[PDB]
Write a protein that binds this ligand. Structure first.
Ligand SMILES: Cc1cc2nc3c(=O)[nH]c(=O)nc-3n(C[C@H](O)[C@H](O)[C@H](O)COP(=O)(O)O)c2cc1C
Ligand code: SF4
Lengths: 102, 28, 427, 66
């Protein structure tokens, strides 16, 4: 795997279902105001859910919602694991292999 | 068990019943 | 320690498991006396846990009793929160998620009854999203009670009540530290801060927070509900209480059990239920901690009680509260590499000792196991491990070497002969 | 105009003496008797830098992705 994008879907395009703009009212309601500025962890992942893997125009979209310069997103999606930047299948299966599982 | 649909979980009872918040500012 | 146990009765600190999962009046145990507790002055709860003095389940010392009556004594301008790990970082821990799975009604109380001591404002928990199903249900457990008017904003009977906001991670180790979690609760990338800013109770979300653990805030209400004089039951004048152990990797029926301190490992492993591998002649090479403690051989471990400071007597102690053992076929050198190959993937990567310093080992550990170029390396590889201690920010480095530091201790030859096994082979 | 070495007159052109201080600096221009000029030493502001002010409630200095 490599962490650079070869201009796949700069304009995919992508958008959220108008059923989802009523939840993002609730997420931001969690946090205090003015620091809000990152709900990114659910909000970026909810977008994975609506789609099933998020292209680069998904990473650019939430920035327009969250007003953070979108290297403060492309970063967070390349740190964690659960998000899948490339495409996937209908079932993405795991085999735990570790000292006990070994 | 409900793969999507965090909605009412987040937005039904939580939305009305998470008071106030005051949370202050932090304008900044 | 009394009778060298650590028994298990129906008198324990956890109410029920197979009885009732859903909501209600907390038919017998829970939510019993509340308005009397909270209506009395808050610092009555503070130091009232000292009758127990819980060391804490966060994998370390530093009894939970101090840090809450610790700073966060005053208050000035800015709110205080609660962040209580639900996460599991250590391989084979498993103690967590059993508390939440069949009995969530306890901890929402554990905060509310607990949070009043902090004088806090809101309640955050945190859970690895890798648990989708079980973690999804807490919201119901929140609602199924909170909706009844049990919590917030006055509930019940006080002028002080506040709700709990679940969150989630993804590929986290982040519970691997406080002063990381309070960063990735925020939405930055999670690189844990420096430990002494202002340690974790000054620099925080916007404002002072305290990072608790699961059964540190879980067992607090019931230990402030009754307490005693039974708060100190087992264990010596130092460590006292009854924690949970979860056995894994060789047994008859590896499963959790509530067991008090100072229990020897030779009766405990064999019990609950059997020893199903060789109770002896299976060589019983054991790991006290989950990932945080190196091996013990057949020596005094089996008579060595599980009391904390009893383990510091041996070359390593364990706060993780887990057990993994081995018998015969498992090649330790083969079975410890996939404990190290794990570390290389979970590390932040800021610090120069951790990053680029763990791989130097992990790249060589696939020499020994495979069997490959000559000794005198072992003598160096020890020094590397001796060379990362004060040099890293978080504990993940201080938890990086011990497995290798304590492999070179306790087994000399198993390596020495294998480097020959390929040496004679080359010939 | 043969190679491109840059040949030159001005037979001093490369000397750097090293003195220990100003009071004893000008000491050697007069005593040997030629004109001169002076510059001044510089050292920084005090200054005030504190980590741990980088996480702030209402302050405008709050870093991300450091
Ligand atoms: C790799 C690693 C993983 C950890 N995982 C957890 C964890 O899953 N849950 C937890 O409470 N603490 C974990 N910790 C340790 C935290 O320091 C601990 O939670 C924190 O000190 C709270 O301790 P206390 O609440 O018992 O006082 C981990 C530490 C490391 C180095
Ligand atoms: S060890 Fe060094 S790098 Fe790995 S996490 Fe702790 S601090 Fe960050």
């Amino acid at each position: 795997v490599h962490r650079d994008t070869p201009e796949n879907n700069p304009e995919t395009p992508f958008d959220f279902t108008p059923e989802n703009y009523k939840r993002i009212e609730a997420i931001v309601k969690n946090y205090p105001e003015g620091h809000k500025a990152a709900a990114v962890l659910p909000v970026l992942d909810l977008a994975q859910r609506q789609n099933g893997w998020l292209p680069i125009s998904a990473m650019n979209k939430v920035a327009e919602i969250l007003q953070v310069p979108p290297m403060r997103v492309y970063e967070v999606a390349t740190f964690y694991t659960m998000y899948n930047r490339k495409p996937v299948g209908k079932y993405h299966i795991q085999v735990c292999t570790t000292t006990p599982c070994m | 068990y409900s793969t999507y649909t965090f909605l009412d979980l987040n937005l039904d009872l939580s939305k009305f019943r998470m008071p106030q918040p005051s949370s202050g500012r932090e304008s900044p | 320690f009394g009778s060298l146990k650590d028994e298990d009765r129906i008198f324990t600190n956890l109410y029920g498991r197979h009885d009732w999962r859903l909501k209600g009046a907390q038919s017998r145990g829970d939510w019993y006396k509340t308005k009397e507790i909270l209506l009395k002055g808050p610092d009555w709860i503070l130091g009232e846990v000292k009758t127990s003095g819980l060391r804490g389940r966060g994998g370390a010392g530093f009894p939970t009793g101090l840090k809450w009556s610790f700073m966060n004594k005053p208050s000035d301008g800015r709110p205080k929160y609660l962040v209580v790990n639900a996460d599991e970082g250590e391989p084979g821990t498993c103690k967590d998620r059993e508390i939440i799975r069949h009995d969530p009604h306890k901890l929402v109380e554990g905060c509310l009854v607990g949070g009043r001591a902090m004088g806090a404002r809101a309640a955050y928990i945190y859970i690895r999203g890798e648990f989708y199903n079980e973690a999804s249900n807490l919201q119901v457990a929140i609602r199924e009670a909170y909706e009844a008017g049990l919590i917030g904003k006055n509930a019940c009977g006080s002028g002080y009540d506040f709700d709990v906001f679940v969150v989630r991670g993804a590929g986290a180790y982040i519970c691997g530290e406080e002063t990381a979690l309070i960063e990735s609760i925020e939405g930055k990338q999670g690189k844990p801060r420096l430990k002494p800013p202002f340690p974790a109770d000054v620099g925080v979300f916007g404002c002072p927070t305290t990072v608790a653990n699961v059964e540190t805030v879980a067992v607090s209400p019931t230990i402030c509900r009754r307490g005693g004089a039974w708060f100190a039951s087992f264990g010596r004048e130092r460590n006292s209480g009854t924690k949970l152990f979860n056995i894994s990797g060789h047994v008859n029926n590896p499963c959790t059990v509530e067991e008090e301190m100072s229990v020897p490992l030779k009766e405990l492993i064999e019990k609950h239920a059997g020893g199903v591998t060789g109770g002896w002649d299976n060589l019983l090479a054991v790991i006290p901690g989950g990932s945080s403690t190196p091996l013990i051989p057949k020596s005094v471990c089996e008579t060595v009680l599980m009391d904390f400071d009893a383990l510091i007597q041996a070359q390593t102690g364990l706060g993780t509260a887990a057990v993994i053992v081995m018998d015969r076929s498992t090649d330790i050198v083969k079975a410890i590499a996939r404990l190290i190959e794990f570390y290389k993937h979970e590390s932040c990567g800021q610090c120069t000792p951790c990053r680029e310093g763990v791989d130097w080992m992990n790249k060589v550990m696939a020499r020994f196991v495979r069997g490959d170029a000559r000794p005198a390396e072992i003598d160096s590889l020890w020094e590397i491990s001796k060379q990362i201690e004060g040099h890293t920010i978080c504990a993940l480095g201080d938890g990086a070497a011990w497995p290798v530091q304590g492999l070179i201790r306790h087994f000399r030859p198993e390596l020495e002969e294998r480097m020959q096994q390929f040496a004679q082979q080359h010939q | 105009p043969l190679m491109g070495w840059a040949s030159t007159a001005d037979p001093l052109s490369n000397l750097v003496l090293t003195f220990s201080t100003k009071e004893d600096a000008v000491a050697f221009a007069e005593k040997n008797g030629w004109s001169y000029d002076v510059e001044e030493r510089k050292v920084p502001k005090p200054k005030s830098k504190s980590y741990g002010a980088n996480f702030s409630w209402n302050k405008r200095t709050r870093v991300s992705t450091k």
